[PDB]
Design a protein. Structure first.
Lengths: 622, 223, 79
């Protein structure tokens, strides 16, 4: 019953009252035998229900006289000899299991009381496991990293980070319950420049350089993700751009950079980019992760970074350009051979029928595998990346069951064959990816069909069928001979007549066997006003707005899907021919370091600095 | 905007604020907004006043303030989404039943005729009340907020007097029935409000018809 | 085309306004027992003696970085 008065007094901030209550409590220690005076006292200062001690309650409430309160409480704990048992207490409920007083001092931005808590012997490995510090959804939880160094780095306070770093007791590479060390946590909380500043990038290089090794940046997450592949798997374009081209111009720490300058005579400079884990030589590279990431929208703005851009171009210069053209020739000849053995039906050099069957089996099997790997169960993905997978599969299986209907059951085998023919030529539209002009034209067809043509077809079909049934139900009996001026006779006949007025074909004839010629003209002219005037011209206007919006960012979407075909061609040719085409070369980067880097030359006429850190004193290619 | 989210961070005057912060650990923070007189629990709340204010043009820029935005979304998550879809199904089936007992005229399971009559009476009465409360005497208001009230009323009363002409006087009862059929399908265009894409497409049809198609029809009819 | 370009900046707001009109018209149509079933907020101890029945909105701000006083609950999280 005394502890409640202690907690109140320490929350309000009354210094003298605290002194008197602690004195009364020490007298309670005297005037009693008990079992263990420091233990019983620790039980008095602790709120057993939550584990919250008097010190943590002193720090949750900022109480402008709170520094004295911490000093008095630490002095009392020193009198009764329980300083470690006191200052290293945690919570004990599922919500905040692990939070210690150092954690509360670091996130309250108390740069003073935290030094007093460290010097008094805190635990710089807190590991606030909890379920609020490790949540399920985004809100109602933080996930700073489960460590006082991770919290001090994720709340943007470098002074406390420096205080934690230059300590012999801190464990800089302690992975938490997710597998994340400090650097996975920093690339987890990172956002863009407009939401937060660039403080996470600055704290990233601060922690990296101040430790100094590759050990911290090759640790494996619990998902097998280096802190680089994590930045690529969740689409942190800013901290990823920083990592991929990171140069340290200091002699002792030159080794842990990813971009070295070779010669740089005047303005001209040839800088080579480390390519170790950003090329598809191993499992889960950064190209494969960025290209095959059907879970983010930051892709086409992450393929423009320096190593990945020159990497994908070198691939569409060595082998991918020719495998693409070769695939186009094979599909073109398969389509022609399909449309000549189907248009020249009856009523040597006719092996084309079994050729079509062979390549239909090939395409069907291959595309079925691709669909099983793409996993299109997630919504919108089928229209997102695997539309042409699905379409190539449909057309190939259509040719299949048109052969397993022609001979096996002898039925109507023309519906499948003719559908397969028309679908084949639409797939040639797929093969426009190879050209920039003709290939980012085919990426506004997709945006325009989705946004504008679908909404127009919905409203137009409503009017077509509404006025079709109204006009049709206005016409009396067929005729005196069952067939005369019955253009708008039945439903489907009136719907066809209205469709032909929209296309502009035929001849408008209003002299119908109608009971009301005026009402007929009113409904028919209203239909003309609603579609020929409003809906079709409004389609052109909205389609102009869509083209204007998606013309700023259509080259990037095109380059992204061209990159998907490049990557799919790469993992298709054998390892001897694969080894024939490699991107970079082994270069002596440090005392003993071979990195197999790319090489990119550039010209800069603005900085004009004296050149040190060159990798080669004599310039030029030799 | 200032009043609805007004926080006083001082201990003696903390009481007269309308937005309190609960926990706010690091960056994350859970602030709760006082909702006393901005929710439609009483008479003349702030939602009812802002939404039913056919006298100002600042409305759609006042519904984006913090309590009112999350308030209207919570309503179109608990009950309004399903009452809307349910109303759309009832009107769709009333239209089909109207267009099958009118296209399959002569020369069990035909209670559809009295169903149409019943729901025509319902819609006519209800929409007539809504028009008397909307008070469309002020200019441009009928095109502003009660266009679909007027159109639903016209179509329902058309079906009415096409029944009170078919049997009571035995006259030309097809002009009313057929006009009512075509008007019914235009009212389905009303029911596009439920979706963002398809529903703010139907709000450029309104702006385009008013500004561009009317002026064009005037000059074109002259020529 | 000129009209579409002008009213495309402010068409989501007009739409949300008329969707709000149907929401409000559906509200004042269902009975008070079913109405009481759906309430937006909850009674929360705001002051010494003040129940306000407030909403609740979470947010994330990475710029201000101030020491936190005036919190309504010292221990964080939903509990
Ligand atoms: C600006 C405009 C834009 C276009 C707007 C188009 C709007 C649509 C316009 C359509 C109107 C066209 C005329 C329809 C009626 C014709 C008569 C007829 O055949 O009736 C038959 C049905 O016929 C059909 O069902 C038609 C064919 C299928 C529907 C049309 C394609 C669907 C859209 C595809 C979209 C694919 C998209 C791409 C997908 C990858 C029934 O006849 P019956 O009663 O059995 O006859 C009995 C007596 N007899 C047997 C002696 C005969
Ligand atoms: C699991 C169950 C599934 C069920 C599905 C049921 C059916 C649902 C279907 C419904 C269809 C809905 C509209 C689809 C619009 C596609 C637009 C499109 O890609 O157009 C392309 C042009 O090609 C065309 O626009 C031609 C489309 C018609 C093909 C010919 C059909 C002929 C009759 C027979 C342009 O595409 P792109 O942008 O160059 O690249 C897209 C591919 N990417 C996403 C990989 C980059
Ligand atoms: C008291 C005495 C009154 C006398 C009146 C005399 C007659 C005067 C009439 C004169 C008419 C003048 C033009 C009206 C234009 C309306 C545009 C419109 O709302 O279009 C809608 C689409 O729907 C259409 O555009 C379809 C319009 C035709 C309906 C079908 C008629 C068929 C024949 C029979 C889109 O509307 P919205 O923007 O989605 O919502 C509007 C509703 N709101 C304002 C509540 C938000
Ligand atoms: C008769 C007219 C012929 C030319 C037509 C195109 C003119 C516009 C050119 C724009 C720039 C451009 O396409 O560039 C050249 C491109 C992109 O090169 P990039 O470096 O990625 O940019 O690469 C190339 O080598 C193109 C190799 C294409 C091989 C596969 C061809 C498949 C053909 C399928 C047909 C349906
Ligand atoms: C999504 C698809 C878009 C494309 C259009 C497809 C359909 C085209 C027409 C096919 C007609 C057909 O074939 O049958 C239509 C059938 C029977 O027709 P029938 O009266 O016997 O006339 C046959 C005449 N012959 C023999 C000369 C061919 O129903 C009807 O008459 C019922 C009409 C009223 C109900 C439908 C109203 C719809 C309103 C709008 C809802 C959104
Ligand atoms: C300029 C605005 C036009 C609006 C549309 C009017 C229909 C077109 C004219 C057809 C006339 C006709 O043929 O019949 C129209 C019939 C009445 O015909 P009646 O007077 O009995 O006889 C006419 C022949 N006499 C006089 C020689 C005997 O309408 C009705 O039953 C009532 C329809 C009311 C519709 C109101 C809503 C309209 C929404 C759009
Ligand atoms: C076959 C295609 C099906 C999908 C068609 C729409 C695609 C585009 C979606 C845009 C975003 C969107 O509509 O969002 C989902 C909306 C807004 O949600 P919000 O949170 O207010 O934003 O809410 C919903 O749950 C929608 C509930 C609708 C219930 C009433 C339906 C009435 C149908 C009337 C038909 C004439």
């Amino acid at each position: 019953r005394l502890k409640k008065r202690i907690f109140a007094a320490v929350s309000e901030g009354c210094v003298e009252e605290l002194r008197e209550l602690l004195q009364d409590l020490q007298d309670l220690c005297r005037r009693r035998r008990g079992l263990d005076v420091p233990d019983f006292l620790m039980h008095k200062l602790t709120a057993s229900d939550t584990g919250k001690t008097c010190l943590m309650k002193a720090l949750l409430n900022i109480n402008p006289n709170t520094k004295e309160i911490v000093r008095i409480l630490l002095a009392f704990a020193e009198e009764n000899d329980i300083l470690d048992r006191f200052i290293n207490a945690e919570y004990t409920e599922e919500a905040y299991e692990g939070q210690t007083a150092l954690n509360i001092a670091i996130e309250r931005r108390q740069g003073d009381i935290t030094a007093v808590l460290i010097a008094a012997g805190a635990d710089v490995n807190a590991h606030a496991k909890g379920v609020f510090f490790n949540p399920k959804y985004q809100h109602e939880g933080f996930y700073f990293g489960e460590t006082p160094l991770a919290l001090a780095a994720c709340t943007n306070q470098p002074e406390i980070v420096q205080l934690l770093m230059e300590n012999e007791q801190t464990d800089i590479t302690s992975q938490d319950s997710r597998g994340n060390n400090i650097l996975h946590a920093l690339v987890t909380v990172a956002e863009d420049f407009k939401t937060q500043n660039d403080f996470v990038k600055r704290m990233y290089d601060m922690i990296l350089l101040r430790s100094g090794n590759w050990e911290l940046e090759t640790m494996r997450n619990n998902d097998g993700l280096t802190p680089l592949q994590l930045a690529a798997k969740m689409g942190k374009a800013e901290i990823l751009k920083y990592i991929l081209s990171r140069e340290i111009k200091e002699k002792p720490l030159r080794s842990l950079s990813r971009k070295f300058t070779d010669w740089a005579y005047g303005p001209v400079s040839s800088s080579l980019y480390d390519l170790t884990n950003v090329d598809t030589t191993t499992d889960n590279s950064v190209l494969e992760i960025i290209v095959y990431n059907t879970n983010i929208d930051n892709r086409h703005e992450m393929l423009t970074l320096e190593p990945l851009h020159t990497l994908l171009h070198t691939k569409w210069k060595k082998f991918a350009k020719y495998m693409f053209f070769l695939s186009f020739c094979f599909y073109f000849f398969y389509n022609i051979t399909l449309t000549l053995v189907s248009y020249y039906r009856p009523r040597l050099q006719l092996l084309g029928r079994m050729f079509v069957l062979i390549w239909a089996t090939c395409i069907s099997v291959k595309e079925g595998i691709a669909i099983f790997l793409l996993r299109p169960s997630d919504l919108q993905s089928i229209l997102s990346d695997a539309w042409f997978h699905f379409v190539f599969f449909v057309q190939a299986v259509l040719v299949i069951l048109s052969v397993f209907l022609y001979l096996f059951a002898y039925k109507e085998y023309l519906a499948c064959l003719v559908l397969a023919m028309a679908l084949g030529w639409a797939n040639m539209l797929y093969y426009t990816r190879g050209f920039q002009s003709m290939g980012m034209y085919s990426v506004m067809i997709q945006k325009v069909i989705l946004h504008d043509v679908l909404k127009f077809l919905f409203v137009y079909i409503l009017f077509l069928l509404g006025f079709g049934v109204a006009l049709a139900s206005l016409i009396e009996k067929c005729s005196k001979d069952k067939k005369d001026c019955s253009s708008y006779g039945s439903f489907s006949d009136a719907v066809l007549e209205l469709f032909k007025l929209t296309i502009g074909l035929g001849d408008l004839n209003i002299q119908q066997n109608s009971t009301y010629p005026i009402l007929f003209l009113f409904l028919l002219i209203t239909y003309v006003i609603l579609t020929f005037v409003l809906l079709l011209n409004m389609l052109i206007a909205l389609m102009g707005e869509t083209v204007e919006n998606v013309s700023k960012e259509s080259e990037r979407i095109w380059r992204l899907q061209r990159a998907r075909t490049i990557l799919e061609f790469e993992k298709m040719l054998p390892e001897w021919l694969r080894s024939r085409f490699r991107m970079g070369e082994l270069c002596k980067v440090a005392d003993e370091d071979f990195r197999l880097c790319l090489r990119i030359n550039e010209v800069k006429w603005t900085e004009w600095k004296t050149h040190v850190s060159f990798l080669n004193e004599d310039p030029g290619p030799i």
